Amino acid sequence: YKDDDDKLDRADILYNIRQTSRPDVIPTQRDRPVAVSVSLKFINILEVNEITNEVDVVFWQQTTWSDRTLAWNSSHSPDQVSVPISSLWVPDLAAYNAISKPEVLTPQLARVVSDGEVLYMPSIRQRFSCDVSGVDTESGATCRIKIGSWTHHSREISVDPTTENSDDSEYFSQYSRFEILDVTQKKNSVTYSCCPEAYEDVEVSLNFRKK
Amino acid sequence: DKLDRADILYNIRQTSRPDVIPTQRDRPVAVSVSLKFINILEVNEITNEVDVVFWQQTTWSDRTLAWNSSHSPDQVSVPISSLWVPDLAAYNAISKPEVLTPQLARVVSDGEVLYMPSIRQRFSCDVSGVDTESGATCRIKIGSWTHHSREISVDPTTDDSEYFSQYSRFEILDVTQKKNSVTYSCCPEAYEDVEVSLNFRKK
Amino acid sequence: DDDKLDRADILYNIRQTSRPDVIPTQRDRPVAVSVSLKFINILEVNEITNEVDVVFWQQTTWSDRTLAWNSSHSPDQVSVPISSLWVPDLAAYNAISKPEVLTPQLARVVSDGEVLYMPSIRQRFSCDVSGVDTESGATCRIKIGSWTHHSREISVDPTDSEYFSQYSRFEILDVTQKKNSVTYSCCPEAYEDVEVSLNFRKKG
Amino acid sequence: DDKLDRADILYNIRQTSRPDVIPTQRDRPVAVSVSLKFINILEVNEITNEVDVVFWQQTTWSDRTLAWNSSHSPDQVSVPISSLWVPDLAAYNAISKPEVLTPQLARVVSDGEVLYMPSIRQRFSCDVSGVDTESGATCRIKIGSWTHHSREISVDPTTENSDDSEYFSQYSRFEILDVTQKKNSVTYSCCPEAYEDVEVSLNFRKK
Amino acid sequence: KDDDDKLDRADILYNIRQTSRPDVIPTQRDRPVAVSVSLKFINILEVNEITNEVDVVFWQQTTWSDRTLAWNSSHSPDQVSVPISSLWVPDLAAYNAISKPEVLTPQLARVVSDGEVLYMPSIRQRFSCDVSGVDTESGATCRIKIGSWTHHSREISVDPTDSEYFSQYSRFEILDVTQKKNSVTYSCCPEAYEDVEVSLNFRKKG
Ligand SMILES: COc1ccccc1-c1cc(N(Cc2ccccn2)Cc2ccccn2)nc(N)n1
Ligand SMILES: COc1ccccc1-c1cc(N(Cc2ccccn2)Cc2ccccn2)nc(N)n1
Ligand SMILES: COc1ccccc1-c1cc(N(Cc2ccccn2)Cc2ccccn2)nc(N)n1
Ligand SMILES: COc1ccccc1-c1cc(N(Cc2ccccn2)Cc2ccccn2)nc(N)n1
Ligand SMILES: COc1ccccc1-c1cc(N(Cc2ccccn2)Cc2ccccn2)nc(N)n1
Ligand SMILES: *[C@@H]1O[C@H](CO)[C@@H](O)[C@H](O)[C@H]1NC(C)=O
Ligand SMILES: *[C@@H]1O[C@H](CO)[C@@H](O)[C@H](O)[C@H]1NC(C)=O
Ligand SMILES: *[C@@H]1O[C@H](CO)[C@@H](O)[C@H](O)[C@H]1NC(C)=O
Ligand SMILES: *[C@@H]1O[C@H](CO)[C@@H](O)[C@H](O)[C@H]1NC(C)=O
Ligand SMILES: *[C@@H]1O[C@H](CO)[C@@H](O)[C@H](O)[C@H]1NC(C)=O
C-alpha cells in the first residue's frame, strides 16, 4: 500500500516468494486440508446438443487458497503482486465430467496477497456431458459440472463453494443465444469402491435457457 | 504437515530414475491397467471408429521410492515427469491420447505408484451392432510400446456403473479385460497387453 | 544501425536489467500501455450465435526506462525475444478462443526505453452481429485489459484499413477505441480496459 | 534385467551420444532402413486426391560408438529419442504434420543398432483414382532425409509384406492389396548432390 | 571426400554454437543482412470461392550468410545440418496469412563452410487473397507478402529470385508464379520494411 508501484520492492517480494514457494508440494499449514475456495462465473454458453447431452461453455474459475509461508509484512511494501503460476503451488483441480481439455484463454498468472492468500482466476473454455434436457422449456435445462482435486483427498484438500448469484450477469454475455437462470454451487464428497478416502468437490449446477 | 511431504519429494527425486525401468531382481515390472469408462462421445458404424473418455487406472511399484512412514505421510502427489512411467500405448488408436487431468501420480509409502489419467482418444474397432439390444463390442489393445514381456508384464484386474455418465447417448452392458500377448513375424520376443472389451449400445 | 557487436552487447545489457516477471513501474506511477488494434480481416461471421472470427495486428507499447542505453554511437532499436522482457498481461474479456499468434514473437526495444510489440492475432469473440446485412452495419465491441493488474499498476491508453484486407467478404465502416473502466461487485479495485468498437458490414 | 546395469548403460549412451551429429563411421553414409507397416486407411477423398492414414514407421540405423559388451548386462534398453541422433525423415507429399501417437522411445541394441518405430497419422496428396474399383488406387508416399545427401544418409528400403495382415485393421473400410518400396535417388538444380528417398506404394481399395 | 569425418562434424557444430548468436542479426560491414526468399509451391488444397481464402503448401527456400560461422572446408566437410535453435534466423512472416504457418518438416538448416545458411521449411498456411475466377481460363491470382516482422531495411533486406515441385494430383494447376521486390511504409513508423510479393496465378483443372 502507498508505495505499491515500487519496482525494487516487487522484484524482492518475487525473489522471496521463489525462495519460499515449493510448487510441487501442497502448502498444508499444520494438518488441516488446504481450504481451496472455488467459484465459477460463466461468460457464455456456446454450443449445446440436445441429442448428445454436451455443452460447450466459457467460465471464469475464481479460485483461492492460502500459503502463508509466502506471506510478508506489507507495511511499506506493496499489498499484492502477480506471479506466474509455474512459480506457485496450484490446486490440481479437474472436472470429472469434462469431455475436452480445459482451454485457458488468459495469462497464467496469479495474485499473491501479502497475507499469503493466492487468487487464481483463469478463463476456461470446455465441453461437458450433462443434462441438456428441457433447454427450450422455460424451467430450463440444468447442467451439473463436478470439480475437485484429481489426486488430493479430503484431509489434504477441501473445497469451499461460497458463491453469489446476484452479480451473475456482470459476467455473462449479453449476446448469447442463451440466458442464465441460476447457478448453484453445492459442496459434496465422493467415495469410490476401489479406494479409501473421500474427495471434496463443488457441484456447479447451471440452469439456463435458449432465449 | 508439509516439511515432511517436501522431504519425501526430495527423496523421490534423489532415488527416482524417470527413464530407467525399475526391475526388481530380474523380474518383469508388473503393471496393472484397468480402464473405467466415463463417456462414449462419438461412434461411427460406417468407418468402425469410436471416441471415448476413460480413466486409465494404472499401478506398478518401485521399492527404491519406499520410505518408513511411521511419522510421515503415507502417500504424496508427485508430477509424473519425476517418475518412471510405463510407456503404454493403445495399439489400435487413431488419435493421440489427450489427457484431461493434471499429470500427477500418487506415490505410496511402500513404493506403490498410483497413476490414473482421464484420457480422450479415438479407436478403430468393431462397432457392428451398436443399435442392437445385444450391442456392439469394441476391443482396445493396451500394452508397452518398447518393453517385451520379460521387462514388463501387463496384468488386468477389474462395478462400471459408478463412473459412466448417466447422460451419455449410450449405455454400458459389460466391460471385461483379459491378458493377451503379441508377437510378430519380424520380431523375436512377446509383448504383454491387456485387451479391454467394451460391450455397449444406444440407450 | 548495424555494427553487430553493439547489438550483442545491447541484448546482454537488456538481459541483465530485464525483469521479465516484474512490472516496470516508475515513481510509484502505473505502467502506461498504449494499445491499438489494426484489423486485417474478418474471416467468419455468425449471426445466429453472435460470434465473429477476426484477424488483427495488436500495436502494443509501453516503457521500461531501465532498459535504456546511450545510442549516440549505437543502434537506436533492437529486436528482442519477448521471453526476455516483461509484457503486459493483456487479455480480451469477451474472447471465446485462445489468441492464436501468427507472427515471430519478438519486440523492438528502443534506446529510450520504449518497447514496441505487435503480434498478429486470430481470435474468436462473442460480440454483436445484428445488422451486418444492413447498410449501417454490425457493431462489434472487444474489451481488452490487463488480466491481473488493477489501474494503479497498469493503465491502458486508447491510442482505417491501411491494414484491412481488400479480399474480405466484409468492409470496415469505422473503428473507435475508447478507454473505459471496469469494476466488480466483488473486488475493490478498478481495471483499465480499452473498448474497441468495430463497425462493419457485408458488401452486396 | 538388473536395474543398475540398465541405469549405467543409459549413462554411457548419454556420454557418447551426440543427438545433433550424424553417426558416420569409417566415412561413408549412415544406412537408414525404413519400413512402413500400415495399420489403417481412415479417409480417402477421390476428387481432392488426398488420403489420411495410420502407419508404423519401422526405422533402423546403426551407431557403433553406442555399443557395449552384453555378456553380463542387458542386450537392449529403451531410450528417449531426444537422447539420440535420429534421421531427419520427411514425407515430401505430406500435407499435414506427422502426428506421433506412441511414446517417443527407441531401443538401443548392444551392437549399437537403433530400433525406432513411431506410430504416425498423416495426410498425403496422392493418387486415389480407382479406389472404388479393384485394380485399386495406388497411393505413392515419398520419404527421405530433409537435409542430408546420399553421401551422408542412405536409405535402405528392404521390406516384406507377407505379414501385412499382422498390422492392418480388420475393421478398416478399405483393404490393402499390396505395398512395395523402391529406393530412388533425386537430384536438385539447387544442389550438386543427390538425396535418396523411398517410394512406398499403397495399392488399396474398399471392400 | 572428407564430408564424413564424424568428429570433424562434431567440432564444426561445436564451433558453430560458440560463434553463433541466435538472437542477434548477423550484420557484416554495416550491411543490411541480405535474405533471399523463394517459394516453390507444392499444393493447393482448399480454395474457397466465397471466403476468398486458399490453403497452400510451399517450400520456403530461405538463405543468408553469417561469415563468422565460416571454416576451412579444405580437409573437413563443406556443410552440416544444424538445428535452427542454434542459429539466428530471419523473423519472416506472411503479412496476409490468416493461419499460423504449420511447419511440416524437421526444423534443421545447412551451414555451408563460407557462412551461407540454407534453410527450407515446407509450410502449410491459409491465406486471405483474391480467388476470383478460379474455374476460368484466366485463373485466380493470389498474392503473398513475406517480410521481416521486426527488422527494417537497413537491418534486413529481402531479395527474390516453374512448377517442378507442384503436386500433379492437385485439383489445380499453376499458370505462373512471379516474385517481386517491394518496400512498404506505414503512417505509423518512420522507416520502410522490405518484403517479397509472390504472385500465384492458378486455376481448377479442365
Ligand atoms: C471473488 O472472486 C474471485 C475469487 C477468487 C479469485 C479471484 C476472484 C476474482 C478476481 C477478479 N479480479 C482480480 C484477479 C485476481 C487474480 C486473477 C485475475 N483477476 C479482477 C479482474 C478484473 C479484470 C479481469 C480479470 N479480473 N475478478 C473477479 N471477478 N473475481
Ligand atoms: C484400482 O484403482 C486405482 C488403481 C490404480 C490407480 C488409481 C486407482 C484409482 C484411484 C482413485 N483415486 C485416487 C487417485 C490416485 C491417483 C491419481 C488420481 N486419483 C480417487 C480419485 C477420486 C476422485 C478423482 C480422482 N481420483 N480412484 C479410482 N477410481 N481409482
Ligand atoms: C503505432 O504503430 C505501432 C505501435 C506500437 C508497436 C508497433 C507499431 C507498429 C509497428 C510497425 N512496424 C514495426 C514493427 C515493430 C514491432 C513489431 C513488429 N513490427 C512495421 C511493420 C511492417 C510490416 C509488418 C509488421 N510491422 N508497423 C505498424 N503498423 N505498427
Ligand atoms: C522389423 O521390425 C522393426 C524394424 C525397425 C524398427 C522397429 C521394428 C519393429 C519393432 C517392434 N518391436 C520393438 C520396438 C522397437 C522400437 C520401438 C517400438 N517397438 C516390438 C513391438 C511390438 C508391438 C508394438 C510395438 N513394438 N515391432 C515391430 N513390429 N517392428
Ligand atoms: C535454391 O535452393 C535453395 C535455396 C535456399 C534454401 C534452400 C534451397 C534448396 C535446398 C534443397 N536441398 C538442400 C536442403 C538444404 C536445407 C534444407 C533442406 N534441403 C535439397 C533438398 C533435398 C530433399 C528435401 C529438401 N531439399 N532443395 C531445394 N529444392 N532448395
Ligand atoms: C511490520 O513492520 C512494521 C515496520 O514499521 C512494524 O511496525 C510491524 O510491527 C510489523 N508487523 C509484523 C506483524 O511484524
Ligand atoms: C520405522 O521407524 C520407526 C521409528 O520412526 C521404527 O520404530 C520402526 O521400527 C521402523 N520400521 C517399521 C517397519 O516401522
Ligand atoms: C552519450 O554519449 C555521448 C558520447 O559517448 C555523449 O556526448 C553524451 O553526453 C552521452 N549522453 C547522452 C544523453 O547523449
Ligand atoms: C566381452 O567381455 C568378455 C569379458 O569381459 C571378454 O572376455 C570378451 O573378449 C569381450 N568381447 C567379446 C566379443 O566377447
Ligand atoms: C586454410 O585456409 C588458409 C587461408 O584461408 C589456406 O592458406 C589453407 O590452404 C587452408 N587449408 C589449410 C589446411 O590450412
Instruction: Return the domain boundaries, chain D.
Output: 1-207
| Among E54, E128, E148, the residue to mutate for chain C (most C Cβ within 10 A) | E128
The DSSP call for residue A18 is H
Q: For chain B, percent helix, then strand, then coil, each to nearest 5?
A: 10, 50, 40
Question: Residue C15 and residue C22: Cα distance in Å, rounded?
Answer: 13
Q: Do chains B and A touch (3 or more CB pairs under 8 A)?
A: yes
Residue of A nearest to C141 (CA): A175
Interface test mutation site (partner A, options C25, C52, C82, C121, max chain A beta carbons within 10 A): C25
- Is residue A151 in contact with ligand 2, taking CB distance under 6 Å? yes
| Residues C163, C165, C166, C171, Cα dihedral to 10° | -90
Q: Which residues pair with B137 in a beta bridge?
A: B199
In sequence order, what are the beta bridge partners of D138?
D203
Question: Which cell goes with E164?
Answer: 517442378
Distance (Å, rounded) from C-alpha C132 to C-alpha C134? Answer: 5
What distance in Å separates the CA atoms of residue D3 and residue B98, rounded to the nearest whole number?
31
State the distance from the centre of ligand 5 to the C-alpha of E120, rounded, in angstroms.
Answer: 6
Q: How far is the CA of C193 from the centre of ligand 1 (A)?
A: 14
As a whole number of angstroms, the distance between CA E16 and CA E84 comes to 11
E45 CB-near residues (< 8 Å, 6+ apart): D48, D50, D95, D125, E55, E56, E57, E170
Q: Which fold has domain C1-204?
A: Acetylcholine Binding Protein; Chain: A, (2.70.170)
| Cα radius of gyration rounded to whole Å, chain D | 19
Around ligand 8, the residues with Cβ closer than 6 Å are C 70, 72
Distance CA C182, CA D117 (A): 55
| CB contact (8 A) between residue B184 and residue D163 | yes
Which distant-in-sequence residues (6+ apart) come within 8 Å of D192 by Cβ?
none
Ligand 2 contact via B116 beta carbon (within 6 Å)? yes
Flag if A5 and C50 touch (Cβ within 8 Å): no
Please judge whether C24 and A7 are an interchain contact, meaning their C-beta atoms are less than 8 angstroms apart.
Answer: yes
* CATH T-level fold of E1-206: Acetylcholine Binding Protein; Chain: A, (2.70.170)
Q: What is the CATH number of domain D1-207?
A: 2.70.170.10
Which chains, if any, share at least 3 CB pairs under 8 A with chain D? B, E
Structure determined by: X-ray
Cell of C88: 503486459
Distances (CA, A) of D197 to A209, D25, D92, D148, E123: 59, 21, 10, 11, 20
Question: What are residue A116's phi and psi, to 5 degrees?
Answer: 95, 5
Place of cell 494438518: A31
Question: Dihedral (C-alpha) A70, A72, A78, A81: value to the nearest 10 degrees?
Answer: 0
Residue A163 backbone phi and psi in degrees, to 5: -160, 150
Closest-approach residue (CA) in chain A for C183: A170
CB proximity list for D191: less than 8 A, separation 6 or greater: D149
Nearest ligand for residue E118 CA: 5
Contact list in D for residue B48 (CB cut-off 8 A) is 169, 171-173
Phi, psi for E8 (deg, rounded to 5):
-60, -40
Residue type, B189: E
Nearest-atom number in ligand 8 for the CA of C73 is: 5
Q: Round to whole Å and give the CA distance between B188 and D79.
A: 19
Q: Chain B closest CA to A7's CA: distance in Å?
A: 31
Resolution in A: 2.7
Ligand 1 pocket: which of A109, A121, A168, A172 to mutate (most atoms <8 Å of CB)? A121
Q: How far is the CA of C118 from the centre of ligand 9 (A)?
A: 63
Cα(A60)–Cα(A39) distance, integer angstroms: 8
Q: Which residues contact E150 (CB under 8 A, 6 or more apart)?
A: C79, C104, C106, C107, C108, E91
C-alpha pair distances (Å), E143 with each of E172, E178, E199: 16, 9, 4
CATH number 3.40.190.10 given to B1-203 = no
Amino acid making up residue D158: T
Ligand 10 touching residue E70 (CB < 6 A): no
Contacts of C23 in chain A (CB under 8 A): 5, 7, 10, 82
Considering only CB atoms, which residues of chain B are within 8 Å of chain D? Answer: 17, 19-28, 46-49, 64, 87-89, 92-97, 124-127, 145-147, 150-151, 184-186
Closest chain A residue to the Cα of C152, Cα to Cα:
A5
| Residues E82/E139, Cβ–Cβ less than 8 Å | no
Task: Inspect the structure and tell me whether chains E and A have 3 or more CB pairs less than 8 Å apart.
Answer: no
Let me know: does C125 contact C30? Beta carbons within 8 Å: no
Output Rg (C-alpha) for chain E, integer angstroms. Answer: 19
Which ranges of chain C would DSSP assign to H, the alpha helix? 4-17
Whole-angstrom Cα distance, residue C88 to residue C154? 8
Of C21, C126, C186, the CB nearest to A14: C21
Alpha helices, DSSP H, located in chain A: 7-20
In this structure, which residue's CA is closest to atom 27 in ligand 5? D190
For residue A70, report the distance from its CA to the centre of ligand 6, in Å: 16
Nearest CA to ligand 9 atom 13: D69
Contact E52 C101 (CB under 8 A): no
Report the gap between the CA of A94 and the closest CA in chain B (Å).
6
C-alpha cell at E145: 507478402
For residue B84, the tally of other CB atoms under 10 A from its CB is: 18
CA distances from A114 to A32, A76, A82, A92 (A): 21, 11, 11, 23
C-alpha cell at A45: 454458453
The DSSP-derived string for A118-160 is: EEE--EEEEEEE---TTTTSSS-EEEEEEEEESS--TTTEEEE
Other CB atoms within 10 Å distance of the CB of residue A15:
12
Ligand closest to the CA atom of residue C76: 8
Q: What distance in Å separates the CA atoms of residue E63 and residue E88, rounded to the nearest whole number?
A: 11
The number of beta carbons lying within 10 Å of the beta carbon of residue B161 is: 8
d(CA D149, CA D61): 16
Cell numbers that stand for D45 in this block? 477423398
CATH number, span A1-211: 2.70.170.10
Residue B21 contacts residue B151 (beta carbons within 8 Å): yes
Query: Do C182 and C145 meet the contact criterion of CB atoms below 8 Å apart?
Result: yes
Q: How many CB pairs under 8 A join D and E?
A: 80
Tell me, using a 6 A CB cutoff, whether residue B70 lines ligand 7. Answer: yes
- For residue B74, CA distances in Å to A158, C156, E67 come to 18, 50, 61
The rounded distance, in Å, linking the Cα atoms of C79 and E38 is: 24
| Beta carbons of E157 and E33 less than 8 angstroms apart | yes
CA A159 to chain centre: 10
